[PDB]
Design a protein around this ligand. Structure first.
Ligand SMILES: *[C@@H]1O[C@H](CO)[C@@H](O)[C@H](O)[C@H]1NC(C)=O
Ligand SMILES: *[C@@H]1O[C@@H](C)[C@@H](O)[C@@H](O)[C@@H]1O
Ligand SMILES: [Ca+2]
Ligand SMILES: [Cl-]
Ligand SMILES: [Cl-]
Ligand SMILES: [Cl-]
Ligand SMILES: [Cl-]
Length: 306
C-alpha cells in the first residue's frame, strides 16, 4: 500500500552536549565550558502515530517506529549527499493513509562501549498533514543547543492510488477484465468491452437483447432456436414446408396448406388442375379432390372416354 520515509539531512552539535546539559563522554574543560574529551555517536530514533491535537512524548507508535545506526559525530551535513539505507528510516503501512499524523524524531548518543547508557541529544515533535507524493518535505529542529534537519514523504506502493494509497489498480487482458488504468486508478475499458471490471463484451449493433449474446466483442450468438445475423428470427420445425413460425420449432401453415408439416395441399384443384376433358374440380380435403365429369367422360379425372 504505502511508505512513510524519513531522511536525516544534517546535524549540528558544536560543543557536544546532551539534553541534560552534560557532555558526550566525560569532562567539560572549565571556564570556556568546551566539551573536548569525545564526540557524540549520533543516531536517530523515529516514532510515527495517530494525530494528536495535544502531542504526547510517550505512547504507542501506532503506525511504526525505527532507528538509524550511528551516522556521524557532533556535526554532519548530508544535504548534498545522496542518502542511503544508513541515514534513512522507512515505515511501511497497509492501512489507508489518514493524512494527519504525529511524528517524533530524536537524536541520541551511543554508549555501549562504556558504563553509562545511551542518552538523548535533542527531541523533535510535530503533528501535521501529508498526502502521497514523491516530493520531500523539509523540517528543521533548531530551538535548542543541537540542531538537526530531516525530510519526510508518503509514497504509494506499485499499483496503489488515491490520498490513502488504498485504491488498487493493475491493468488486464484476461477472463477477469480487459482494461488499462488511468491517472486516478480508474478502469478504462478496452475497445469492445464494458462494465465496472470491463468483462462484458459489447455485441453486434442490433443483436437481440432477448435472443442474442456475446462472449467476445462484435459477435452475436443465438439462443437455441433463434437464428439470423441479429438472432431476430425463429427456426421452424425441421421438415416444415409451406409453414412459418413465431416461436422456435413451430410450423404454422400458409394459406391452403395443412398438417403438422404443412405438406398437405388444401387447394389441390388450383395447384395441379387435375380434371381433364372439361371436368370440374372440387377440393375434398388434405391432398384430396373430386371431378364432376361431363357426359361420355369417366374416371377420377374424366380420363375414360366413350
Ligand atoms: C475516478 O477516480 C476518482 C479518484 O481516484 C474517484 O473518486 C472516482 O469515483 C472515479 N470515477 C469513476 C467513474 O469510477
Ligand atoms: C363443371 O362441371 C362440368 C361437368 C362442366 O359442366 C364444366 O363446364 C363445369 O365448370
Ligand atoms: Ca558517546
Ligand atoms: Cl506542530
Ligand atoms: Cl542543522
Ligand atoms: Cl487472478
Ligand atoms: Cl463487468
Amino acid at each position: 500500500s504505502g511508505q512513510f520515509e524519513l531522511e536525516i539531512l544534517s546535524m549540528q552539535n558544536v560543543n557536544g552536549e546532551l539534553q541534560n546539559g552534560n557532555c558526550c563522554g566525560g569532562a567539560r574543560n572549565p571556564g570556556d565550558r568546551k566539551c573536548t574529551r569525545d564526540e557524540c555517536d549520533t543516531y536517530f530514533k523515529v516514532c510515527l502515530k495517530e494525530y494528536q491535537s495535544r502531542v504526547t512524548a510517550g505512547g504507542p507508535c501506532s503506525f511504526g517506529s525505527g532507528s538509524t545506526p550511528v551516522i556521524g559525530g557532533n556535526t554532519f551535513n548530508l544535504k548534498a549527499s545522496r542518502g542511503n539505507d544508513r541515514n534513512r528510516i522507512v515505515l511501511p503501512f497497509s492501512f489507508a493513509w489518514p493524512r494527519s499524523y504525529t511524528l517524533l524524531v530524536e537524536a541520541w548518543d551511543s554508549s555501549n562501549d562504556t558504563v553509562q547508557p545511551d542518552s538523548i541529544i535533542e527531541k523533535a515533535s510535530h503533528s501535521g498533514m501529508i498526502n502521497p507524493s514523491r516530493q520531500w518535505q523539509t523540517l528543521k529542529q533548531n530551538t535548542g543547543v543541537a540542531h538537526f534537519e530531516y525530510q519526510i514523504r508518503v509514497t504509494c506502493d506499485d499499483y496503489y492510488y488515491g490520498f490513502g494509497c488504498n485504491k488498487f489498480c493493475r491493468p488486464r487482458d484476461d477472463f477477469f477484465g480487459h482494461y488499462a488504468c488511468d491517472q486516478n486508478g480508474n478502469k478504462t475499458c478496452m475497445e469492445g468491452w464494458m462494465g465496472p471490471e470491463c468483462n462484458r463484451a459489447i455485441c453486434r449493433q442490433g443483436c437481440s437483447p432477448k435472443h442474442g449474446s456475446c462472449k467476445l466483442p462484435g459477435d452475436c450468438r443465438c439462443q437455441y432456436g433463434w437464428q439470423g445475423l441479429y438472432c431476430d428470427k425463429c427456426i421452424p420445425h425441421p421438415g416444415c414446408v409451406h409453414g412459418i413460425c413465431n416461436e422456435p420449432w413451430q410450423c404454422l401453415c400458409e394459406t391452403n396448406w395443412g398438417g403438422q408439416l404443412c405438406d398437405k395441399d388444401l387447394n389441390y384443384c388450383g395447384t395441379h388442375q387435375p380434371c381433364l376433358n372439361g371436368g370440374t374440380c372440387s377440393n375434398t380435403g388434405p391432398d384430396k379432390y373430386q371431378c364432376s365429369c361431363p357426359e361420355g367422360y369417366s374416371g377420377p379425372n374424366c380420363e375414360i372416354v366413350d
